[PDB]
Design a protein around this ligand. Structure first.
Ligand code: ADP
Length: 243
């Protein structure tokens, strides 16, 4: 079964604005973990915005879980997709409030489950005020890597069938990165996952990597196969980011 399909998608942000996505064709199997790489401004984040129907394409269709999103219930769509946001944990609010910031009636049990997958439960549990800890500075002083694991738990709490990782805007501490990489298979288990990767190394082990350039998918495949394509943009990017 395919959880996500783009057919002939053309998109621009405003009536006269430049075309940002052109003739995008992609079909992602249920449970696939996809990495999307490409230079800044290639259209990676825009592709994810369309999955959520934040914007409507001028040509083509997006189909989610088989449903054309034009026809799909927007409430159902919002429940199908969890997004790991960057730098979006609310400082003036508690950890649990941050994690359940979609369904405030969210069971403590559901919150802790999502926190365990995210690898946040352990550090939260060792805080004086636990889940009731106010995230904010002088209110506790959590790190960016701790906050990022909180952001993962938030994304996971409603058990989304599709999980999207927005591009990383900062480096996290070794501890937090280690916990996340160790827990990734648990976080992704049973879900279709899209990771927008600043560094190609991040998605070396994805089922498939999609390479975007100037709003088109130029290359797609497994890491080893993309490196086998003689003059591939993938290899070029791989070389550029290499030590
Ligand atoms: N909200 C927006 N309004 C107008 N243009 C946008 C908006 N968001 C992104 N863009 C433009 O769309 C292009 C693709 O951006 P984006 O999808 O964010 O690329 P990437 O994620 O690969 O860095 C860029 O030229 C960007 O400036």
């Amino acid at each position: 079964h395919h959880d996500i399909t783009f057919r002939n998608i053309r998109f621009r942000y405003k009536p006269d604005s430049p075309v940002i996505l052109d003739n995008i064709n992609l079909s992602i199997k249920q449970g696939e973990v996809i990495g999307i790489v490409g230079r800044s401004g290639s259209g990676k984040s825009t592709l994810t915005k369309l999955i959520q129907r934040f914007y409507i394409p001028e040509n083509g269709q997006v189909l989610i879980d088989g449903h054309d999103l034009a026809l799909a219930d927007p409430n159902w769509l919002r429940r199908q997709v969890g997004v790991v946001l960057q730098d979006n944990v609310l400082l003036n609010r508690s950890i649990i409030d941050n994690i359940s910031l979609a369904n405030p009636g969210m069971s403590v049990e559901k919150v802790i489950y999502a926190a365990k997958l995210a690898g946040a439960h352990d550090f939260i549990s060792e805080l004086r005020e636990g889940y009731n800890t106010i995230v904010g500075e002088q209110g506790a002083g959590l790190s960016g890597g701790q906050r990022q694991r909180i952001a993962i738990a938030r994304a996971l709490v409603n058990n989304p069938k599709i999980l999207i990782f927005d591009e990383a805007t900062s480096a996290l501490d070794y501890e937090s990165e280690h916990v996340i990489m160790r827990n990734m298979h648990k976080i992704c288990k049973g879900r279709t996952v899209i990771i927008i990767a600043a560094r190609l190394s991040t998605v070396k082990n994805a089922d498939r990597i999609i390479v975007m350039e100037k709003g088109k998918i130029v290359e797609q495949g497994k890491h080893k196969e993309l490196l086998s394509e003689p003059e591939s943009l993938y290899s070029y990017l791989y070389q550029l980011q290499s030590d």
